[PDB]
Design a binder for this molecule. Structure first.
Ligand SMILES: *CCC(=O)Nc1nc(OCC)c2ccccc2n1
Ligand SMILES: CCNC1=N[C@@H]2[C@@H](O)[C@H](O)[C@@H](CO)O[C@@H]2S1
Ligand SMILES: [Ca+2]
Length: 688
């Protein structure tokens, strides 16, 4: 299906052959980036004075004079027509002609075109991506590929602002990029121009900015150096900072100075954008004038960014009305999905949904903050492009599938099968969740309800679970060997391994449920235990980032089903045969006995810890919490917030410091046991 869907479309159910012999009118006067696409689509066909007429141009060109009343009078609009006698590709402006050609390219199938007439233009003026996350910035190659992808989906905006780029942010925002990075940025700009994308270079100076002449001038000089590299759009971000940089008068004055002294002196600057310090409703001070001050003081052509009612949120009619009244202009949305920089152990490959589809006139722009996995983010980015171009016709589910089919034609079903179970974020501090595994959830819930209570589970439900696990393994194995988009596969691989293991575990657990004899059960139980260990090894060796290390997959429905089923069936087996099989679901090589306590230990990088508790705690009469590691290690430190040994019996005390935060270095002392008993979090850090 055409993506994004045109504003107006009339199809005739004739079809016509892309002309073998054609006559091209407007090649020397239309957008050269449009003419280039057209000639690629027409190579091997004969350009000659006789034959089918193709007319390409912008309003004002000689080539499309006949069609000027058909051309929408909208920025980035176009008119496209195909019939028996002629083809017309006509923009309101140069970018419109390029976009005509991106629609044309999707219409052409097996050298044939439908007889069609289209009038199209975007509902939202600025549409795109802000690489504005924390973590590993996108590679240069990833970015080249992104920019072509934006062009094909009529996204006109790429805002460059990776938080970990030292020349964008703290500390080196005052310095020009080194030669190597500068030549790369220059190449990005050329490629963005060829795909009709505005490269917006942002700067994040607010953590140590001084409100003086010197820093003002250095900021302009940096902007000037970026102008030399080809940049024609600019932004200044004041997000996630404290101190003097948060002053709204000074922010507005700086932005206004940049406008008057730089954006108004150059012949050719397009966007000028700021992001505020209070960038969502729940974070704006009620007893405060931060947003009204920006609203009143900031020059009216300067955009202001906004994430919604919370840091992570979907955009509502009431929410956008709320911010527009204060900032006095339509908000430029920074939408925090599929960004995963706060749940880095998850991929977010689900559909794009939750945003009101009737508020196009209430937003200046709409951009998505994506994951650090660039190719993976294309599912959401394609969807956002469709949303923001034509929100009234926005179909979440269909666009999700179209995206998957574009990104991985050779294995789209397998990719969809993986993504359906890799959508949710798990629990997080922002409270933001997404649907996952919704097709199997019914059967999952019934099966488990029965099985726990005492009744027979429905056999179709059991088979649906089997079906699922089988299909999961097919998709994992096919995906891992796919070479049509190697960069995608490299990104998702650790999660593909973990997903396969989840599926294998699921199958073995269902064979425990069918429970032929005693020794079959035990073989299956041992196989599960080994798969649990394998999952632990992936979780400790893959994606070892400093925030949320490891790899979690199918967490919403599938892993809890499997874990709860295993626990249940192991309990029934213990009851039946008077045995003592361990029913725990996650492999943990360290042990933790106590009197108080059913908190599972966790391993994160070189940290061994107890899971933070809830039921506030009963502790008296020499009661102890003993942790035994699986070997002796050099101890770095311990940290606790409301004794050691290698031996078991031979103990030495440690004295904790105090800041409300108890903590003591162990200066590489050998440690295997750690014990605590009543006096005056819980994290041992070791050398790995
Ligand atoms: C481990 C996180 C990282 O790479 N850096 C970082 N992250 C965050 O939040 C990530 C969600 C952050 C917030 C405020 C200030 C600095 C920060 N640094
Ligand atoms: C104008 C909004 N700016 C924001 N800055 C931060 C981003 O860099 C993070 O990626 C995001 C989610 O962790 O949270 C905030 S939203
Ligand atoms: Ca022209």
């Amino acid at each position: 299906s055409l993506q994004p869907p045109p504003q107006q479309l009339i199809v005739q159910n004739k079809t016509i052959d892309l002309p073998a012999v054609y006559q091209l009118n407007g090649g020397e006067e239309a957008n050269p980036h449009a003419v280039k696409v057209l000639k690629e689509l027409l190579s091997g066909k004969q350009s000659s004075k006789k034959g089918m007429l193709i007319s390409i141009g912008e309003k004002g060109d000689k080539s499309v004079r006949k069609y000027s009343r058909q051309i929408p009078d909208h920025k980035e609009g176009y008119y496209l027509s195909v019939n028996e006698k002629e083809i017309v590709l006509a923009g309101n402006d140069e970018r419109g002609t390029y976009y005509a050609l991106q629609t044309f390219a999707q219409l052409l199938k097996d050298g044939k075109l439908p007889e069609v007439e289209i009038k199209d233009y975007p509902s939202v003026r600025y549409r795109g991506v802000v690489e504005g996350f924390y973590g590993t910035p996108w590679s240069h190659q990833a970015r080249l590929s992104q920019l072509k992808f934006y062009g094909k989906n009529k996204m006109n905006t790429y805002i460059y602002g990776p938080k970990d780029d030292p020349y964008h942010s703290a500390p080196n925002w005052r310095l020009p990029y080194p030669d190597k990075e500068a030549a790369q940025l220059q190449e990005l700009v050329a490629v963005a121009n060829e795909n009709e994308v505005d490269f917006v270079w942002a700067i994040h100076p607010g953590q140590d900015i001084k409100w003086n002449k010197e820093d003002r001038d250095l900021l302009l000089a940096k902007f000037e150096k970026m102008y030399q590299l080809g940049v024609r759009s600019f932004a200044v971000f004041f997000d996630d900072i404290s101190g003097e940089g948060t002053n709204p008068q000074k922010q507005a004055e700086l932005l206004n100075y940049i406008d008057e002294k730089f954006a108004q002196v150059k012949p050719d600057i397009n966007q000028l954008v700021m992001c505020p310090t209070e960038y969502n409703k729940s974070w704006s001070n009620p007893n405060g004038n931060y947003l009204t001050t920006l609203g009143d003081k900031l020059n009216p052509s300067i955009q202001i960014m906004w994430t919604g009612d919370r840091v992570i949120s979907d955009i509502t009619r009431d929410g956008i009305s709320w911010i527009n009244e204060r900032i006095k202009r339509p908000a430029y949305i920074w939408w925090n999905f599929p960004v995963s920089d706060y749940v880095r152990d998850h991929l977010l490959l689900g559909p794009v949904y939750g945003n009101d589809t009737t508020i196009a006139k209430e937003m200046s722009g709409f951009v998505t903050n994506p994951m650090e996995h660039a190719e993976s983010s294309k599912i959401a980015i394609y969807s956002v492009a469709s949303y923001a171009w034509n929100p009234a016709k926005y179909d979440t589910w269909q666009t999700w599938k179209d995206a998957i089919r574009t990104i991985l034609p050779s294995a789209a079903e397998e990719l969809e099968s993986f993504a359906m179970h890799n959508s949710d974020l798990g629990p997080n501090g922002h409270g933001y969740r997404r649907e996952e595994s919704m097709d199997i959830q019914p059967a999952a819930e019934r099966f488990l309800k029965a099985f726990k209570e005492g009744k027979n589970y429905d056999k179709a439900d059991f088979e649906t679970l089997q079906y699922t696990f089988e299909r999961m393994k097919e998709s994992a194995d096919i995906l891992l060997m796919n070479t049509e988009n190697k960069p995608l596969i490299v990104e998702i691989t650790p999660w593909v391994h973990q997903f396969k293991l989840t599926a294998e575990m699921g199958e073995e657990v269902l064979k425990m449920v069918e429970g032929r004899n005693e020794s079959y059960f035990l073989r299956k139980y041992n196989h599960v235990k080994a798969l649990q260990q394998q999952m632990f090894y992936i979780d400790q060796t893959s994606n070892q980032n400093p925030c949320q290390p490891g790899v979690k997959t199918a967490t919403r429905v599938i892993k809890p089903l499997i874990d709860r089923t295993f626990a249940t069936v192991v309990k029934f087996f213990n009851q039946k045969f008077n045995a003592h099989l361990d029913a725990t679901t996650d492999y943990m090589p360290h042990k933790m006995i106590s009197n108080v306590k059913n908190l599972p230990l966790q391993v994160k990088a070189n940290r061994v810890l107890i899971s933070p508790a809830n039921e506030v705690v009963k502790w008296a009469a020499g009661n102890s919490v003993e942790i035994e590691l699986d070997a002796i290690y050099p101890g770095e430190n311990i940290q606790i917030n409301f004794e050691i040994s290698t031996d078991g019996k031979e103990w030495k005390t440690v004295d904790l410091k105090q800041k409300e935060r108890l903590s003591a270095g162990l200066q590489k002392a050998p440690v295997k046991f750690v014990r605590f008993t009543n006096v005056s979090q819980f994290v041992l850090t070791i050398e790995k």
